[PDB]
């Protein structure tokens, strides 16, 4: 299929809001955001920025990469999804 | 530590080391030229798409550079907006 990307919104959603308990305008206060910015995170919608992981980061205890990590991991795996036999069908490499 | 741009990295650790013209690459990769000059200038980032793209073209982990891209845009976000992140947030009480 293969491995199902996994949006970071997922892991805010069943790894710190399931437990924790917060709503997600509770989220957006804390990280000084709208809360619009949260849900669309929540729902899988809307990506994380670089600023956004910052702000999680001290918000919630973690690294930023862990974040964006977790975004880039998700990109690729949806851009292989969609598009990976196409570019492997168009790409030739370069060695000279 | 300060900001390096991904395409720094493709701009003097393979193109200056293997000698292609920016139109080889985009040809190469199955892309517009202007779309590889705007990475090589650093005017912007690199996308999953010319990720998977590049890491083909050049033998490379898709990851190497997107990670690259990541650290990039942290450090710059940190750089100029870290003071106004850290007056603006709240951890959050369980």
């Known amino acids: 299929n293969g491995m199902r990307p996994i949006h970071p919104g997922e892991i805010l959603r069943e790894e710190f809001q399931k437990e924790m308990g917060f709503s997600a305008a509770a ?5 000084g955001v709208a809360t619009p910015t949260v849900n669309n995170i929540l729902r899988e919608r809307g990506g994380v920025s670089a600023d956004m992981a910052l702000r999680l980061s001290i918000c919630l205890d973690t690294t930023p990469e862990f974040w964006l990590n977790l975004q880039t991991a998700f990109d690729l795996r949806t851009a292989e999804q969609q598009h990976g036999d196409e570019i492997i069908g168009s790409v030739q490499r370069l060695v000279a």
């Open 27 to 31: 989220l957006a206060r804390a990280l």
